């Protein structure tokens, strides 16, 4: 009746609970102490990515009132972004279908 299949090395107390640990736990030693070089790697890492996001290479974006406040008149523009076509590139490395988006 499937209740009597027990190896001699296996007891009765352990079985029945099951349910496993929610996440398997093996502390990896790659989380050691930080040094000045590691902090510098982190700093240069955060400068990177930030540079490419403050640059023109976002292509990620998917108060919008049809009426303009007088405060919005003679007010500073947010930022005149350099368009993807505005920055020069090499035609020999881009496909023909990608030429139209660029400014020839």
């Amino acid at each position: 009746n499937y209740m009597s299949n027990l190896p001699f090395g296996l007891g009765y107390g352990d079985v029945g609970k099951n349910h496993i640990t929610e996440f398997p736990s093996i502390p990896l030693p790659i989380n050691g102490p930080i040094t000045n070089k590691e902090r510098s790697l982190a700093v240069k890492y955060i400068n990177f990515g930030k540079t490419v996001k403050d640059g023109p290479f976002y292509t990620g974006s998917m108060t919008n009132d049809g009426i303009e406040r007088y405060s919005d008149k003679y007010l500073k523009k947010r930022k005149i972004g350099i368009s993807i076509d505005d920055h020069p590139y090499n035609l020999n490395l881009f496909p023909n279908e990608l030429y139209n988006v660029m400014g020839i």
């Binding site: 996440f23 398997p24 736990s25 093996i26 502390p27 990896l28 030693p29 790659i30 989380n31 050691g32 102490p33």
Partner: protein, 136 residues
């Protein structure tokens, strides 16, 4: 042999045998053994390639006979079995003619993967911790 005993493999006994075979090789291979590593990594001396710094099975057998640490005579095949058992665990290297060498045993005993005893876990309830078994 003595390894077979009461149907058990003598946990405290075989462990004690495995920790005496490589110790002599650590004090017989280097010019000063392990005290050459006590002045620092930047002051140890190494033997010339031509010298025969390797250890043969006859000298190890003489050690294990004169030491009287196990109270049991050992066959040469038995000593070969012991050193085959302990060739693992990063203890002794295999080179031809049954010879042994240690490279990082002292560093182990006292990212640079091949030694993690200088790198401790996160040891905090924080997040971002990595686990090797999280994927399975």
């Amino acid at each position: 042999g003595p390894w077979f005993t009461d149907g058990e493999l003598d946990i405290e006994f075989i462990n004690s045998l495995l920790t005496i075979v490589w110790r002599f090789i650590s004090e017989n291979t280097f010019p000063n053994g392990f005290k050459n590593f006590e002045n620092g990594p930047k002051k140890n001396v190494f033997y010339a390639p031509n010298v025969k710094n390797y250890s043969t099975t006859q000298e190890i057998l003489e050690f294990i006979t004169a030491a009287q640490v196990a109270n049991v005579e050992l066959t040469p095949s038995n000593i070969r079995s012991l050193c085959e058992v302990l060739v693992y665990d990063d203890k002794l290297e295999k080179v031809t003619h049954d010879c042994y060498r240690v490279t990082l045993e002292s560093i182990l005993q006292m990212f640079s993967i091949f030694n993690y005893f200088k790198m401790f876990p996160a040891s905090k309830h924080d997040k971002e911790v990595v686990y090797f078994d999280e994927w399975t």
